[PDB]
Design a protein around this ligand. Structure first.
Ligand SMILES: Nc1ncnc2c1ncn2[C@@H]1O[C@H](COP(=O)(O)OP(=O)(O)O)[C@@H](O)[C@H]1O
Ligand SMILES: Nc1ncnc2c1ncn2[C@@H]1O[C@H](COP(=O)(O)OP(=O)(O)O)[C@@H](O)[C@H]1O
Ligand SMILES: Nc1ncnc2c1ncn2[C@@H]1O[C@H](COP(=O)(O)OP(=O)(O)O)[C@@H](O)[C@H]1O
Ligand SMILES: Nc1ncnc2c1ncn2[C@@H]1O[C@H](COP(=O)(O)OP(=O)(O)O)[C@@H](O)[C@H]1O
Lengths: 445, 437, 54, 436, 443
């Protein structure tokens, strides 16, 4: 509901068959048959979950669909599987080192599934009668919990009374108590007992009285990443650092102890390891120290599958003074397999543009689609994809529903691409600030 | 008397109902094509459908890129969020620059929440706490009284705790918010002002209005406000603390888990109809000051599902990108980001619209300029720069006022040109002189 | 009870320590309360009902 | 007055200008620089009008020509309760603040909010205090007899007055002041009782006092930031105040001006050595001058076609051309013999240095051949040499002795260049041996 | 007997009453014009009138610039605040370098204050609290007042303390029979210790035993205190000394330098000017000495240009060995002594000249007499020739190995063989460099 239409919202996964053969147009993915087949092979390895630490480099020219292929892999991966999509610039931080940030990105992409059984008694409290013991030990209580339908009486122990007096629950408060584990919550105050007070308190919350059965059974599946366990065991109250982010370079011995405990919890069967994918978009923006740490960190058994994206040619590696293919050193490319994405022809440009126009609910005419395809082949895919929405707004300002040739031509005239802007800058270089800072603001001499 | 800034005279894009830019309308003159492009952009923003759209305003200095950005801001209205920013502001020494960019991204997505404000104001006449033990009080009966009459309320022990926090006794005008539960003691009434001849009590009058007052308000928050509301390393934002806490809270890298939880809570409140989502504009002037790492994170963050419309400004040409060594790119923006942009070209001016800009700035600053003085100012603007005349307009008015004249004359313009120099004359003085000017 | 000036009838901010007359400000104190003869304070206190002389 | 020894700009009491903004040749401690002083008077009238926001001016010229003297004259002629924030260019390179945040704090320290309020005060001389204690101490009663030169009254005290008078112990004979609403008692001091000493205050106790507060926008930003107490106004650890707090402060200040409860006092932000900022600070200044709540920024620099910090190219005044496009430049020139002589005479008159006419001529010749600051520094050491010989007047021989003992720049350069083997050069080479 | 350092032999500038310099007095040899200029500067500091006066000591290595700065500090006396500093010390990882420079500027300005202290001192006889009637309200404390009885010599009185003062009492662990000392200015309590009126041989906590304090309880005593402006600034920036919880928790936090604002400094200046106007405090301006001023970069020099123009800035003296050198932090700014010409224009350069053979010889003689060594005349002449040939500092620092080799062979005198053996054992920089140039495996 909150999500708007983004650049990759039309992709619902890799458009493959059961034989890992890509369809020409399926699930929002058009073309790139070799790349989609290779990504389908990658997805199966993640789904097998029996091998660890493979580095996959998605390489190609820009606007060819490396990030589109990564989002297709993430959508085909399904839910409750840890997919961590980060950029290469996020590793450089201020209170975390680059290796520690890479370790946190690695351990956020592999988790454990844990099954929980809850016997929840949810209802409004009618009366709490406390049997006051003479010695004070084993304080018996009588809880009158009540739903819309029906109401029982529960016996309450001393720690139950201490938990129900630690948080302030009174008559008319909606609480649910777990029978197996004794978990305590306070959902708030019932709406039936809401008008008795003229002004509500600071922490007073109003919730509806639950209906149906008083006690309900539910099975809850929790997917907890390894980084979550690291942050929890790093501090006394570590759950705040899961959200505020000031974890602060978790020491190694916590990580080895957590790895050994995850192994023994696996061997006794109360949790199961779910591996996932860590996707580093624009991986060329990383230091050589980051690349060396990636090279050593891919060899652990608790390591996810690493998909890296690069649009660089033979470029200078960051942190050094020599050039390298993909902006990556040769020992990183040694422990990697490369998926190459190619450019699109006119039919693939037209199909992707039609899919993006259908996603944004824009009614493109045939001549407007042909003009946008010609502009996409001439300039770029992303220029025509950005031109579609402003042409839609131009046509809507003209009191028209569908777009025509004139709306696309007006959007082409109003908004420039890279080559036209380069030509306009190079024709009048005195009006812009040079690399030496020189400029001519004066219009006459 | 209102002050005048550099962009005070601009009230909007000056377009009609058909989107065609009127030549002189809305504080603008000329620049019709970029104004129409910005009108298409604000129509796209008002559609409230797209995310991550990016437009770059490219043109020379003193051509109106920031003018068009603030014109977009007035065309959208104060309801739509607008985050103006400089590319230099992302370099923080507390948190990393990509986190600052993502925080400014979340600062441009807002929420409207309709809410009620109900207030009980007046002097406490009765304060009777009913205990009904099961030590612990059951409730408290509080009788407030103003000049229009009295009213009795039943309050929970939390509000009784807040009342006894404020040292509220019988005879004190107090303030109670029914929804929040906040209790504020205004002070003792003047009916009890003569119990002693001298005491530390602050004696305030009885409220002239009713005890109970209810009204409707709207809360305009952002997603960054809700992000920093529940991401505190040291909590306690609810308590009123005039003095600072003993440990200074520092800006931290907010994880994506809090962003997803905040998004889930906001979507749940939107699906109930309580809150309304308003996508807005993040404007970055002087985008050439961004590092290549910030450009890479901008490339990653423009593909988010909740990203706002980003408007970038630059005045450079074929320039090396900051943080690189040999990447010659237009406007200082790398070509991978440029592929995601829509470029709006900003044209220079000629003499006539420079003259009308000068006369519009003179009319807004309430200065009377004679016609030949206006022609001299326009000729100086064509010769030196437009902003030189726009900044010499006010010394001309001061030199006219010190000679007891309300009309700027040609001699005032000559005196202001003699007293204050432009960049070219000062550069000539710099070049001719030897000992550091 | 509200305290009032014993001679002008306005707000009595101050009371003179000698004759116990409540006065309004400085001018009334210097022109009336200070040059007040003995035996004139009793009527001013009697109008308020504080005539201590029986 | 406060703490003030004799400094470099102590003699400047403002701009020596007429009612027609015409500079006198010698007035208010400032001589020379007629065009620069008239331009500074125009800028001062721009500040005093208050209707013009965010104007950047550049005071440029050779060293020892009076750019900082002009800024001090503007600051002295501004008056009280108008915020003048003078900072150097190196002050904004902080370890706990970003440079744009430090520039924001410097910008918003120069805009004040003027609020007038009324308070009832009781300032009087205590005649006596009586307090009758109870049997146990549950209730305390007391009478406070206070007086002024005109009035004399007795007060029946409550419990809180008794507790606030026993604390901060007031005896008979003390002139004190009481705020009734806040319950604060300030002991102004002992009265004229022979037995510190302050006279008995004037009459009309319980008086309305009008207090006019000028609070800078940075202080309200620190206050409204709920994670920042006002102790960060003194400790300095404000720590990157968020932008949304500043937007709420701007909207509240605008609605206070609209309601008439407060006024806006624009001020001057002076940046000495503005060339020391780098290019990102220049871009931030270029955008931040457009705010409605922005002060007038005076910038001083002496560099000429220097390399801009953060870049690799050279720009005039060390400033990029987009910043110089947004600014009007005031140019200061050098001084002749007569202006140097008048400045040296003013500096001697300030430091209570009595010197002869030929000594003044010798110091003027030294300040013409060498520098104005070298002669102005030589004045005080020549005076010390004069009082070493038990002479109250500085003669020619005292100036000659001071010139012999203390060197200028050119003599130090020549004496170094004649003996360059004895010093450490760029390569770290030195011959510490004196023989062979 | 006494431990000696490089500048132990110097007692002062050694000038006459007319300011002229005797050739060999005050531990100084030579540098007559430099000593006279330093005496003029010392008289300028003693005038206590000017602000921001800055001189530069310029010369080669081992010429006596730090010697002249120490002589200035010795001639000014211990009351005048002298702040020695290195240009490298301003680079701090906790706070910016300009704040460190301003902190040293405020540290070089001193204040002498007479302070009246209200004191309740005496032996605790009874200590009974009065409990609150509702202890668990959450708004007050468990007690309301505390009655404490104190007796001094010829005097006994009782005090009713509020719970804050009793909290300060009980944090000192005060019991019955303890002589204590309550300072009413801050609420601070000093526990002097156990009274000697009881038995003092049955304790296990190595406590001290004190008599009853003389005079009455509740004295008012006058203390003369010497502080700096930086002490007031750092006390107000990090508040400790009150009994409120902010002061007490700020006692326990880790101390860290902060950028003290101009508002706090102006408020401190206002309070100090009020102290002066009441005639209770006096201002003593002092000296900030910066040796190796070449280590400062261009930002510190730029801030120094502004900071020297202040009306409270001290007298700043600088030292540098550099000649025509580039300024640190710049690229092409060649400047004399590594100091930019904007600061040089605000300076007064005091030149320092190298020494001759006989001056080096008597410097070696004075360093030998201050280190309690006996040197023969021929060995002293050989030490003088070695000092003129290699370096003065090498000849001064070879005296202690000569004394070690002399006391090894059971002699008090230093013979020529001892200084020859010390020349053979220890090498100067030139002979070491000659070994470096004629070696293969990078000696
Ligand atoms: N195979 C594809 N199917 C559908 N859309 C695609 C495909 N490839 C690219 N696109 C579209 O092109 C745009 C840019 O592609 P992108 O994933 O950014 O390529 P790269 O990551 O190589 O720059 C995306 O918004 C995406 O919608
Ligand atoms: N077309 C225009 N009509 C009216 N005023 C304009 C126009 N273009 C620019 N201005 C004015 O010129 C001033 C400087 O322009 P600005 O937008 O700062 O240039 P830049 O695009 O380099 O930021 C602004 O105050 C603006 O009000
Ligand atoms: N016109 C003037 N009138 C009086 N004093 C002046 C004048 N110009 C300069 N001075 C004095 O000369 C000294 C050095 O000038 P300064 O302000 O430092 O110039 P700059 O800042 O350009 O180097 C200052 O102490 C100043 O008081
Ligand atoms: N005039 C002098 N008389 C006596 N000793 C001196 C004299 N000048 C220098 N010295 C000695 O020479 C040594 C070097 O002096 P110092 O000032 O530390 O070096 P620099 O001059 O390089 O700063 C010091 O230990 C000092 O005792």
């Amino acid at each position: 509901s909150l999500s708007l239409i983004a650049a990759h919202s039309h992709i619902t996964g890799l458009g493959l068959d059961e034989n890992l053969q890509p369809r020409p147009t399926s699930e929002g993915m058009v073309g790139q048959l070799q790349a989609r087949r290779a990504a389908g092979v990658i997805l199966k390895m993640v789904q097998n979950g029996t091998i660890a630490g493979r580095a996959v480099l998605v390489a190609g020219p820009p606007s060819t669909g490396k990030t589109a292929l990564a989002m297709g892999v993430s959508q085909s991966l399904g839910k409750d599987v840890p997919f961590t999509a980060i950029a290469g610039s996020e590793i450089f931080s201020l209170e975390l080192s680059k290796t520690e940030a890479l370790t946190q990105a690695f351990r956020k992409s592999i988790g454990i599934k844990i099954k929980e059984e809850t016997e929840l008694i949810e209802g409004e409290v009618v009366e709490i009668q406390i049997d006051r013991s003479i010695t004070g030990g084993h304080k018996q209580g009588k809880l009158t919990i009540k739903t819309t339908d029906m109401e029982t009486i529960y016996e309450l122990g001393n720690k139950m009374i201490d938990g129900l007096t630690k948080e302030k629950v009174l008559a008319g408060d909606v609480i649910s108590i777990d029978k197996a584990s004794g978990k305590i919550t306070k959902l708030g105050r019932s709406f039936a007992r809401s008008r008795d007070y003229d002004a509500m308190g600071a922490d007073t919350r109003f919730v509806q009285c639950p209906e149906g059965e008083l006690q309900k059974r539910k099975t809850v599946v929790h997917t907890v990443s390894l980084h979550e366990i690291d942050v929890i065991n790093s501090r006394t109250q570590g759950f705040l650092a899961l959200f505020t982010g000031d974890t602060g370079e978790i020491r190694s011995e916590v990580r080895d102890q957590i790895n050994t405990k995850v192994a023994e919890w696996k061997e006794e069967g109360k949790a199961e390891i779910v591996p996932g994918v860590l996707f580093i978009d624009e991986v060329h923006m990383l230091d050589i120290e980051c690349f060396s740490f990636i090279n050593r960190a891919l060899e652990d058994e608790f390591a996810p599958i690493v998909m890296m994206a690069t649009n660089r040619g033979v470029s200078k590696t960051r942190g050094t003074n020599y050039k390298s293919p993909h902006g990556l050193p040769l020992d990183l490319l040694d422990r990697s397999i490369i998926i190459t994405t190619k450019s699109y022809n006119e039919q693939e440009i037209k199909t992707i543009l039609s899919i993006r126009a259908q996603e944004e609910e824009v009614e493109l005419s045939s001549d407007a689609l042909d003009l946008l395809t010609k502009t996409g082949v001439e300039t770029s895919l992303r220029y025509s994809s950005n031109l579609i929405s402003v042409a839609q707004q131009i046509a809507m300002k003209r009191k028209n529903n569908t777009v025509e040739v004139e709306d696309v031509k007006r959007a082409y005239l109003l908004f420039l691409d890279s080559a036209r802007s380069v030509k306009y800058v190079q024709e009048n270089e005195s009006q812009y600030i040079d690399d030496q800072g020189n400029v001519q603001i004066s219009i006459a001499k | 008397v209102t002050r005048t800034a550099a962009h005070t005279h601009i009230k909007g894009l000056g377009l009609d109902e058909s989107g065609v830019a009127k030549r002189v309308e809305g504080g603008f003159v000329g620049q019709i094509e970029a104004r129409e492009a910005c009108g298409v952009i604000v129509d796209l923003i008002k559609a409230k459908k797209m995310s991550g759209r990016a437009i770059l305003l490219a043109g020379g200095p003193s051509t109106g890129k920031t003018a068009l950005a603030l014109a977009i801001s007035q065309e959208l209205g104060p309801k739509v969020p607008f985050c103006p920013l400089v590319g230099s502001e992302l370099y923080s020494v507390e948190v990393k620059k990509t986190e600052t960019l993502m925080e400014n991204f979340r600062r441009a997505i807002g929420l409207r929440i309709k809410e009620t404000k109900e207030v009980y104001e007046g002097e406490v006449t009765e304060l009777t706490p009913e205990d009904a033990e099961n030590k612990t009080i059951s409730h408290v009966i509080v009788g407030l009284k103003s000049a229009k009459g009295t009213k009795t309320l039943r309050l929970d022990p939390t509000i009784y705790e807040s009342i006894q926090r404020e040292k509220v006794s019988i005879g004190d005008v107090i303030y109670i918010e029914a929804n929040t539960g906040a209790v504020k003691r205004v002070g003792r009434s003047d009916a009890y002002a003569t119990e002693f001849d001298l005491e530390t009590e602050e004696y305030v009058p009885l409220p002239k209005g009713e005890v109970h007052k209810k009204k409707e308000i709207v809360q305009d928050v952002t997603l960054h406000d809700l992000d920093v509301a529940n991401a505190r390393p040291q909590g306690g934002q609810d308590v009123i603390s005039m003095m600072g806490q003993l440990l200074k809270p520092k800006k931290t890298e907010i994880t994506e888990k809090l962003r997803q939880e905040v998004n889930k809570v906001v979507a749940k409140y939107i699906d109930q109809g309580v809150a309304e989502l308003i996508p807005g504009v993040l404007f970055i002037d002087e985008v050439n000051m961004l590092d290549i790492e910030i450009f890479t994170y901008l490339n990653k963050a423009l593909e988010s599902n909740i990203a706002p419309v980003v408007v970038l400004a630059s005045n450079r040409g074929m320039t090396t990108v900051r943080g690189t060594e040999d990447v010659i790119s237009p406007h200082g923006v790398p070509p991978d980001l440029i592929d995601r942009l829509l470029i709006v070209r900003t044209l220079p001016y000629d003499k006539d619209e420079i003259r009308t800009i000068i006369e519009r700035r003179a009319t807004v600053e309430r200065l009377q300029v004679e016609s030949s003085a206006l022609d001299l100012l326009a000729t100086m603007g064509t010769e030196t720069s437009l902003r030189y005349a726009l900044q010499l307009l006010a010394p001309c008015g001061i030199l006219a006022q010190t000679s007891n004249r309300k009309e700027i004359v040609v001699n005032d313009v000559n005196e202001a040109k003699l007293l204050f120099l432009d960049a070219k004359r000062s550069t000539k003085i710099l070049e001719t002189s030897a000992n550091y000017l | 009870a509200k305290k009032y000036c014993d001679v002008t009838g306005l707000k009595g901010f101050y009371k003179s320590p000698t004759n116990n007359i409540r006065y309004h400000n400085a001018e009334i104190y210097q022109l009336i309360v200070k040059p007040m003869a003995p035996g004139v304070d009793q009527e001013y206190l009697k109008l308020r009902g504080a005539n201590f002389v029986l």
